[PDB]
Design a protein around this ligand. Structure first.
Ligand SMILES: *[C@H]1O[C@H](CO)[C@@H](O)[C@H](O)[C@H]1F
Ligand SMILES: [Ca+2]
Length: 769
């Protein structure tokens, strides 16, 4: 490997061999069908709300999130980089697709598949990833750095449906070598959203943009239809000319054929026919190819950038609504702008790289932090793009000042902005994209007094319940299968209108968002203040016995939605205490004296009774009335965790908090698989895992990372990082279960999982507060 020295891969990048088999992989541990796309994954490409494309460590474009809210795992075999090399003096050259696999059927059988094992590595530190190619039959070593411009405090380039592939080639040998790199792409119009005639009218054109000291050559793969529908738009691939390289292309090859129309050209001398052909197809799939060819002398290095863009301006949800995607603000809405997007990337990628380096550098340069922690911190952010992210720039056929946003809980439970989970998962947004975070919170503020008296069947018990109650915060802002932002509370497993955590978490999120953006945004507090007061006032009515604390009702009425709480719970009770203290502080800021006095009164009473009812001398009991009320819950002091972040001081005595955290580390971490797998949710005081429900026997990745941040704030530095390390290990390490770029909600002691590609573990960013 001589190519690594010619590029700059951070030591904290996650790494795996190209073509590596992984033997230890986990699988779903639930009764019903659950997504398991395998461990062959990679860091995604694509901006927020753009639709994303997962190119795996084996090289294939395989995890398709272009249909917003959906996960489709299938390798589109025509989409590849390929290489040709010929040593000067040799009769023939060699050609090879850079994909560690082959197609299932006879399509593209002429291409040279099965990139060999032990001949290259994949690296990832989101939003960047890299591949190196170090192959005994390829004298010139090659590397590529690929990325999308995902940039904190930037809401423009961060939205773009574009990827850059920056190639580096180096000749370590003593002979001249002719080298070609070719990018192939299928015209994927009709891949989704088209019921019939899926390729019909697809056509490819070549764009040659020549202007002093710039040449870009690109293929634009579109459809003859000028219709404005979810399925219609354009894909583009292309390359920017650099000194010493020539560009060739082929506008149209058949993807539903043996591929020899293209490959016979590339495999001969690495030079394509430059044949333009705009003839639209009928049944056959078609694609385009862009290649560069150059000669590398001994010791010579060349860099050449390719790019990929996709202009699919309209997202459609299952309930029928069509919306424009965010990036259309910058490029237009007509779906004929793929080249413009591509060109912007090819002309500005070096600037984008520096912007990404500038935001990663403060963390990467901190030598007090272990590299494994940095691996997790950056790579967990994949989910902000890969979580079915929806970011609208207008309803089709409708202008507003704001652009609504939504991140999925996950794909198995297809619910946007599950607030009980975003309490954990939204840290990267408040810390790095705070304008998005505040918009989402205003979305919730706007729903507070919505009432929908239509009824739905509750999944857990079969009872009927009202969809949305006035003054209750919704569980979610809908489903991609229905009407995001329009029909809220799509979730029906439990009735969220009786949950005891949503209203308090809402208030805590509001105040968090004020504190972590500098305590200057009074307008955000003013916007949300009525909803905050309403939320707390409604939750106070759920106190059955006048101890000043809402009563959990002996069913799962909070985020642990199969784990029953009854009476005063440590979890919901501490959240309530903290929410009251937050609301007192907002009341002071907004000069609402009567609110300050009322919430201060409620706080003092609740605090006294919480301590009396739950403090057992070692930790806080799970609750006051359940069968296993004395279980040690990993999340027992969630309200104090947030109070620390919000700078609200002690809601419970420091000594008691430290004892409880130490107990959790001693039991829920260290007595669960020797502390190598995170914090199990519930442990009996005899040191055996609580079996009252499956969720008690699960480690929740986002709960564990948040607990690690709580420990860190409280000076339990070793415990914090040891607790978090178990989650990193399970997710990323060779000894783990192969969950990279699909971190699940949960695993059990056998390491098998529930709900891959999950929102909650974004909470690792709470460790950076
Ligand atoms: C999705 O599932 C999780 C449990 O894994 C719940 O906390 C959320 O409320 C639900 F929407
Ligand atoms: Ca009560």
């Amino acid at each position: 490997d001589k190519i690594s020295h010619k590029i700059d891969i951070p030591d904290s990048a996650w790494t795996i061999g190209i073509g590596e088999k992984f033997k230890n992989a986990g699988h779903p541990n639930v009764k019903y069908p659950m997504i398991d796309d395998s461990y062959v994954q990679g860091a995604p490409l694509g901006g927020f709300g753009a639709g994303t494309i997962g190119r795996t460590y084996n090289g294939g474009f395989s995890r398709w999130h272009l249909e917003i809210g959906k996960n489709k795992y299938t390798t589109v075999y025509a989409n590849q980089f390929s290489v040709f090399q010929k040593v000067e003096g040799n009769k023939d050259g060699v050609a090879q697709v850079l994909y560690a696999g082959e197609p299932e059927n006879g399509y593209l059988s002429s291409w040279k598949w099965d990139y060999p094992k032990e001949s290259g590595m994949y690296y990832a530190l989101y939003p960047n990833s890299w591949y190196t190619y170090t192959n005994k039959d390829l004298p010139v070593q090659l590397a590529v750095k690929q990325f999308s411009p995902i940039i904190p405090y930037n809401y423009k380039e961060t939205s773009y449906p574009v990827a850059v592939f920056k190639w580096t080639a180096y000749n370590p040998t003593n002979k001249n070598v002719d080298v070609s790199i070719m990018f192939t792409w299928q015209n994927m119009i009709g891949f989704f959203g088209k019921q019939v005639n899926v390729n019909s009218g697809n056509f490819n054109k070549i764009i040659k943009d020549k202007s002093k000291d710039s040449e870009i050559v690109a293929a634009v793969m579109g459809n003859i239809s000028n219709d404005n529908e979810e399925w219609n738009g354009e894909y583009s691939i292309g390359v920017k000319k650099v000194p010493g390289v020539d560009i060739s292309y082929k506008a149209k090859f058949v993807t539903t054929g043996d591929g020899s129309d293209l490959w016979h050209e590339f495999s001969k001398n690495g030079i394509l026919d430059n044949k333009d052909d705009e003839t639209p197809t009928k049944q056959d799939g078609i694609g385009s190819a862009i290649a560069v060819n150059f000669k590398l002398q001994p010791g010579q290095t060349i860099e050449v950038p390719f790019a990929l863009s996709w202009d699919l301006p309209i997202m459609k949800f299952g309930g029928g609504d069509k919306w424009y995607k965010m990036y259309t603000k910058y490029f237009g809405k007509n779906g004929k702008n793929s080249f413009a997007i591509l060109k912007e990337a090819l002309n500005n990628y070096q600037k984008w790289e520096k912007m990404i380096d500038d935001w990663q550098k403060p963390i990467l340069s901190n030598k007090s932090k272990p590299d494994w922690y940095k691996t997790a911190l950056f790579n967990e952010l994949y989910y902000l793009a890969d979580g079915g992210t929806a970011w609208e720039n207008g309803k089709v056929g409708e202008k507003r000042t704001n652009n609504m946003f939504g991140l999925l809980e996950c794909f198995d439970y297809n619910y946007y902005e599950t607030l009980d989970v975003r309490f954990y998962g939204s840290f990267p947004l408040v810390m790095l994209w705070p304008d998005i975070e505040k918009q989402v919170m205003r979305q919730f503020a706007d729903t507070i007094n919505v009432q929908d008296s239509s009824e739905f069947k509750v999944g857990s018990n079969g009872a009927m319940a009202v969809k949305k109650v006035q003054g209750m915060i919704p569980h979610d802002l809908g489903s991609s299968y229905a009407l995001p932002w329009i029909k809220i509370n799509a979730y029906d497993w439990q009735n969220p209108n009786i949950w005891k955590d949503l209203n308090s978490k809402y208030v805590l999120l509001v105040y968090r968002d004020y504190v972590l953006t500098g305590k200057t945004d009074k307008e955000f507090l003013k916007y949300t203040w009525k909803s905050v007061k309403t939320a707390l006032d409604k939750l106070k009515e759920m106190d059955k016995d006048n101890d000043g604390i809402p009563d959990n009702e002996g069913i799962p009425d909070q985020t642990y939605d199969t784990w029953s709480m009854k009476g005063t719970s440590a979890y919901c009770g501490s959240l309530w205490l903290a929410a009251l203290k937050a609301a007192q502080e907002i009341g002071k800021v907004l000069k609402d004296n009567e609110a300050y006095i009322k919430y201060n009164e409620w706080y003092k009473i609740a605090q006294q009774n919480f301590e009396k009812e739950l403090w057992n001398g070692e930790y806080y009991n799970f609750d006051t009335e359940s069968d296993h009320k004395d279980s040690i819950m990993a999340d027992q002091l969630a309200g104090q965790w947030y109070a620390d972040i919000l700078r609200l001081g002690d809601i419970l005595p420091k000594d008691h908090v430290q004892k409880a955290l130490k107990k959790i580390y001693e039991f829920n971490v260290m007595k669960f698989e020797n502390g190598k797998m995170g914090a199990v949710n519930g442990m009996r005081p005899d040191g055996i895992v609580d079996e009252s429900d499956i969720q008690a026997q699960e480690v929740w990745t986002g709960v564990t990372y948040a607990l690690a941040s709580f420990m860190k704030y409280r000076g339990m530095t070793e415990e914090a990082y040891n607790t978090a390390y178990g989650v990193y290990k399970m997710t990323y390490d060779k000894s783990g279960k192969g969950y990279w770029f699909r971190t699940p909600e949960a695993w059990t002691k056998d390491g098998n999982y529930r709900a891959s590609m999950y929102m909650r573990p974004l909470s690792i960013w709470s460790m950076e507060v």
